[PDB]
């Protein structure tokens, strides 16, 4: 036993939560009379698999100094019939006499799956044996258990019956800083050529696993092996560990992550400078999520509970999406975004428990903001009514208190045919129309265009911002892509003349901007803007 | 064994009923030749898990003084195959050898689910052995068996056949004062700092259960442990039992609700001051609700037992919802609200069979009034199933045992051609757009749970909103509250920026919120409701 905190760390919030929730037998054995009962009587761990949850349990039992005693879960499935209760009853009786015991089983879906998966008799008998051993461990000298599950829907809800397995602590995936921590710890073994800071690697990667970052580190060292020709039993590499930034980018091009397409949960990094204008609107969207978190006395002063979200109907654009990202960044709260295709999956695909799973993820990862987009798509597809999604949405938000403040940010192209029921109070009625973005917002968009972009003189960004009033900010990012395409068309094409004969000029100029402002279009028409301003008739009841 | 009867509470009506039904072994065993048969044979216990039904059975066995012997159902499933009759016939013969015996079986659905879900043979061997034991206890010296079930439909319907396990006592989840009672129990063992009276913690923790309140009272002390920097094995962490209201609202902020999104059954604390006006309407509603319950002599005078509910149509407003809550408050009856998304869930999604269980919970929860909302949304979603079982279940409901069905409807024409027929809910009632006295009651609801002072002209806003809605006037009240809070943030930001809360909304905030409201009803929308005032001289 040689593990530590930092090995599979990075997820500092969840590891700090499990630090606060597990340390109660550590140094405080008689405190259970003061607290009344231990909140750990079994701790469930759902997430994308293989994220070092087993090493998380090993690390927390190392820091408590308790008898860890890992039991491999599918070994019970690997035992023969009639003796499958061995190494579980024996393990629990071993942990009964050893009072500092933090039990960790793993792959509980092998042991205790969904009720549809429980065909056969020995599997449900193993399930019953484990849960009866668990509630037999009532207090029983401060012994707890930990599990390793995919998601709570895939396991037996009889184990999720409370009084046992009541703690759900959602390790999930790390952020760019957490992936930087995992990448730094896994590169403690190796040595790099210092041509990369590895924050660009951890920021560039998306949806990976800590074991997948171990695979990236292994493939970078493998590329260091692959570059050199086969030395005759040589330690010429063992003193010259020289993995490069080229090795890391080629490893990133090769690797296929596993936790891809799972819904991300963590706070994003926008820091409010992408957006501009709508100062009372941005103050309102700041306050509705921040002051429930930062000033509970102010909503304790007046007990009238504010709404738990908005509806950003308006023109199609990424400004509402980046605004909703920066809201959770400035609140420093978690963020889950469920866009249009995922909403269409419940109507085309017909799995309406997914809405329950998304809101359960939102509740379990509180404080959080649920961003929703393209909500009219399931209704405009019907046109050319709620249809299993919107009624599910109203079902979940009705069962949603102001405590565990899940925030619901909608985004809609057309407010006419979305839902009559969302306009009523008690539901989510905040018709915050963000307009087509004006000149200050487009200057902020141009400032965001400078991010990860070498910039110099000669560019007339103010002239383009003055011309493109009707062109939206998402469309201004589109013409930034067009000008980038025109620059990339001629950058290395300039120096390929040198190689054809035998400077990169890494700056976009104004002629590329003029060609890009010739080529494109605009993503709005005025006959949509008039029905956007149709809601300005809201004067008097 | 240390649990007293007063240790568990909350469900006062349910605990009174189960003390009424279990006490027949207690002190009067010779009463069985007077009553003929013992009315408990098997008592079924449904409800969400974590409500302390094991504690309830232990406490009722402790006040009875009977041989309890609780067994948990999955321990039978934990045993080896072919010897699983251990702790089943052994347990029932152990209860046979001791006459005051109250068997409690925890998690019956792990033993006896529905029979088609009992794939394989040994599950129904165990279920058959248990039920043959159940009717093998014919009288057998006053033994009865209780069983912790999750839901009545989830267990085998053969197991609830009249003769074994036919007493349903519908424990359910507790109400707000029941939550206060369980909170007082869980804070009896510990001590707080008395900044909160624990009513203000318990009157909003909706959808929570006794295990949830145990989690609240545990994590409040955990927050108190989190408050100190470090105590190195010393008794300052034990004597300073000083958890705060901030710790309790933080604990509710870190509370995962177990039995939320469930049909709640509580008495709703409205007390009639929310809605005024409509003297004839309120007279006939308290007539048709309370007087069948509290005056059965006048309804045994004559035989025309009236309708089992009414229909409310007109504009979409919260006044009829709080009205339906307040009538059940005034009769002190239970209340289950069936909402629009709940009714729309079954029709597009094919969940129709749970209507048979919602009406079953209604029938168990009698006397009660059922509120139904937005029933035309299923009707208006035809152009862009479930209601045919509401039209079956109330038709299969007796003239007594009130389960009164209150409907909420936008368009009164499109709902149902059969509900206006007598025998069904033929009492069409147009609850109108809210008028001046109703809006005064809306202002009374606005100043309810609100800090108040002078510079208020709520009557001036009432006269500005003369022929206009009151639910949108409540929306005006949250808009003015939102205006007052954001200017009540800037009052204290100068003290923190340079280095009073003003807890009353002023009149300029209300007159600014006047400009951010819309007519919810239209004049032709009023006219198509008022066309149904055609019921006149024949």
Author numbering:
A (entry chain F): 199 to 432, 439 to 588, 596 to 713, 726 to 764
B (entry chain A): 199 to 432, 439 to 588, 599 to 713, 726 to 764
What do the study's own words say?
Six p97 monomers form a functional complex, featuring a double-ring structure based on the association of D1 and D2. IBMPFD/ALS is a genetic disorder caused by a single amino acid mutation on the p97 ATPase, promoting ATPase activity and cofactor dysregulation.
To analyze the activity of mutated p97, we first assembled an in vitro complex of full-length p97R155H with p47 in the absence of nucleotides (molar ratio of p97R155H hexamer:p47 monomer 1:10). Four NTD densities could be assigned and shown in up configurations, and they are rendered into slightly different orientations in the azimuthal direction along the C6 pseudo-symmetrical axis. Our structures also showed that the arginine fingers exhibit different conformations than those of the wild type when p97R155H binds to p47.
